[PDB]
Amino acid sequence: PDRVISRQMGPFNVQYSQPPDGFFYPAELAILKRFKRSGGLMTVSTSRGEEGRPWAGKTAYIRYGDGL
């Protein structure tokens, strides 16, 4: 739990490997992330703050004819 690298009590010594950054090693992280689609690529859509009015220009339209 304390992520030690070594311990030595009397004539007993043990050396550990480098602990993972969080809970999972990079291989375990890759295994966990296998459920992400498109190989982990994600896209964020951007905008310029402009609302957008596609109906503009068609507003001043008077119907002349039979009407269907």
Partner: protein, 50 residues
């Protein structure tokens, strides 16, 4: 006068009755030009100097 005293000046002759004017017919193109000019104005107001 005998009839309604108004005579209509039609811009375009059409069998479907669409009285089309030169303004509302070309609105998208003029708006496109205005948008291009607006983009250029924004570019030179915000991204014109080092």
């Amino acid at each position: 006068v005998g009839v309604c005293p108004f005579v209509r000046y039609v811009n375009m002759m059409d069998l479907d009755g669409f009285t089309m004017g030169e303004v509302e017919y070309l609105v998208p193109v003029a708006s496109k030009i205005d948008k291009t000019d607006y983009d250029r104005l924004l570019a030179q107001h915000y991204n014109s100097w080092k």
